[PDB]
């Protein structure tokens, strides 16, 4: 009579997006989170025979493969498997009700879905559609799991925030519209991953690595700055902002990311630290990495990996103009929330990511992730960039005496507490300032604080 084929498929988009907590994006697309199943209605040309077989196929990226977990083939089943799976929940005439699930280890990104039918000793194959798959912070087994509901709403679902600024004397704040839900922004942030060096040099590997928030996170720390890769923002601290916008003139991420796209992925002029941190925050919250913005007053820039900010004098008092070490009035970066399978169970939670081009890391302006817990314990041999970030929050300022004749130098004074003050992020639910200094280091003036500093100096 006729072979089994698909008439139409209802993705039940509204319903699934609500369940997957993606209902807030301004988009007509099916946006999903990994690990969580979704339900679809598939209207066939007939009932299922008990000799016929349906096979689902999903792929993401340009060189998808089973081995790399970027393509999957799975039968319509009654058995719930481990990986990708499709469960037949009911048949009603020609209509099948199907529950499809993704692994909690699946690469995030855009996927294509196809169905392959074996019937009447023949094989057919049709494209069903496409969807977006994000990280899933509601899912206890996802690496980005954040169990507390209030915290999740803040650090994922909140599209407006507050960055602290100024100096120790005079702390202020500015509003920032993260704007992750506005039109095209989720899409642009996905674009970013497809334009990294990582991807340009080995797309197949890059896309397989998108299952991992450590990887996605660090790529973003590179790609949000123009350096190296034609990323989103170009920094300028000259004071003269000719040929572009004054950094103090941006109010959020949306203009920036759009202007980047519209110029054909050409850098946007110009940004400073808070502008990098705010734009990176949009990207992180978009993709499902809970994140927030951190400000640090008296932030050290150490330029020689010794955990100290060095000033230099002749033994007579005259100041020798040597060293590059400096200290900012304030600096701003991001923390993202994930477990660290590369490090150990004791190192999960908040991870520093910094898109402001200060120092290079494996030749590139990138920075993090760095276990905040790690930084506090002085465990600075760990990945990534932990000496730089230790210096930022807990450098000692040292004045040195240098004898030109003999080339001897020695310590003169040490100031062990001027660096890293009033470290700050927006409150959950309100616009109050949380202090998180004690999360980054032991209490200034204490014993432990000095014994870490020592530990850390020996870990270099």
């Amino acid at each position, epitope marked *: 009579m006729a072979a089994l084929g698909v008439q139409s498929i209802n993705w039940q988009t509204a319903f699934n997006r609500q369940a997957h907590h993606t209902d807030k994006f301004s988009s007509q697309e099916l946006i999903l989170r990994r690990g969580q199943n979704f339900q679809v209605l598939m209207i066939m040309n007939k009932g299922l025979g008990s000799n016929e077989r349906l096979e689902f196929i999903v792929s993401t990226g340009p060189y998808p493969s089973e081995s790399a977990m970027t393509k999957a083939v799975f039968p319509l089943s009654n058995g719930s498997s481990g990986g990708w799976s499709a469960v037949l929940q009911a048949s009603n005439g020609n209509t099948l009700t199907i529950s499809i699930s993704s692994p909690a280890s699946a690469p995030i990104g855009r996927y294509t879905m196809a169905l392959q039918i074996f019937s009447q000793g023949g094989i057919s194959s049709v494209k069903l559609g496409t969807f977006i798959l994000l990280f899933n912070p509601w899912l206890n087994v996802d690496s980005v799991f954040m169990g507390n509901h209030a915290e999740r709403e803040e650090y994922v679902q909140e599209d407006a925030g507050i960055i602290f600024v100024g100096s120790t004397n005079r702390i202020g704040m500015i509003g920032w519209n993260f704007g992750q839900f506005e039109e095209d922004i989720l899409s642009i942030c996905l674009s970013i991953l497809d334009r990294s060096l990582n991807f340009r040099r080995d797309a197949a590997t890059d896309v397989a690595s998108r299952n991992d928030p450590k990887y996605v996170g660090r790529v973003l720390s590179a790609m949000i700055n123009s350096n190296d890769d034609n990323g989103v923002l170009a920094g300028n601290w000259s004071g003269t902002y000719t040929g572009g916008r004054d950094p103090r003139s941006w109010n959020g991420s949306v203009e920036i990311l759009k202007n980047w796209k519209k110029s054909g992925f050409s850098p946007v002029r110009y940004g400073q630290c808070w502008v990098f941190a705010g734009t990176l925050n949009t990207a992180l919250r978009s993709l499902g990495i809970p994140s927030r913005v951190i400000t640090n007053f008296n932030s050290a820039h150490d330029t020689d990996r010794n955990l100290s900010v060095d000033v230099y004098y*002749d*033994p*007579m008092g*005259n100041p*020798l*103009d*040597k060293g590059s070490d400096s200290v900012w009035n304030f600096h701003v970066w991001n923390e993202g929330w994930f477990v660290r399978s590369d490090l150990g169970p004791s190192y999960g939670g908040w991870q520093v990511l910094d898109a402001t081009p200060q120092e290079r890391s494996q030749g590139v302006f990138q920075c993090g992730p760095a276990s905040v817990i790690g930084v506090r314990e002085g465990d600075v041999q760990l990945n990534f960039d932990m000496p730089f970030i230790f210096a930022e929050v807990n450098a000692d300022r040292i004045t040195w*005496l240098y004898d*030109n*004749t*003999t080339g*001897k130098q*020695w310590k003169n004074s040490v100031n062990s507490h001027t660096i890293g003050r009033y470290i700050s992020t927006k409150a959950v639910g309100s616009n109050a300032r949380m202090d998180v200094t004690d999360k980054y280091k032991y209490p200034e003036g204490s014993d432990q604080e000095r014994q870490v500093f020592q530990k850390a100096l020996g870990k270099l």
Partner: antibody
Amino acid sequence: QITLKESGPTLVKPTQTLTLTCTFSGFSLDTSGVSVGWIRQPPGKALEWLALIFWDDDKRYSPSLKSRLTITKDTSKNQVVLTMTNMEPVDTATYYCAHRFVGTLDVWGQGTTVTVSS
Amino acid sequence: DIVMTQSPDSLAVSLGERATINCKSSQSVLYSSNNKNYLAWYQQKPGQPPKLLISWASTRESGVPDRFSGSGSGTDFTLTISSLQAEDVAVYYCQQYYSLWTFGQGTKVEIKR
């Protein structure tokens, strides 16, 4: 006022080992930033700087003579010792110790003369 | 490395005349960071050790008569004795302390009479 006095064997036979001792008064080699050094002057010739020790027992030597030289201080006795090996007649000279702080070598001993002879 | 070359090699001035003594350096002994000249001048009377007249090219040590003045910068330096007394007869050495210590060969100064 500062003063320094050298002391040790005046005579010293070839391929032996010279040991000189500087005794000083009117400063401490325990003060930060302070150094004592040695110089020698062969009969009718130019002064040659030999070595230098700091308060924290950092040291520097003439690069040409490093292998022969040794400098120690005994800060309890206000004394600094010099050890030159393989004394040949070429090394017959007057041997000075000197104080140093921030400047050059500002205050010198009277100097003791050292003869290398069988 | 650094080599100190004095001129002249010897010198006789009449009592109360000006005596000039020069020193040249292999290299600049001027540290760019403090803009100070690491050069010194000594005097050596017979039977005595050298006595330091002048550090930093030009600053004179506590207690030294005003008639001794030091000039120069970089690699060319000059020790001037404005009015030579009978008791100034001696050997004048220049010295660099930019990189460890090296001395000039010395210049002998006598009274022409």
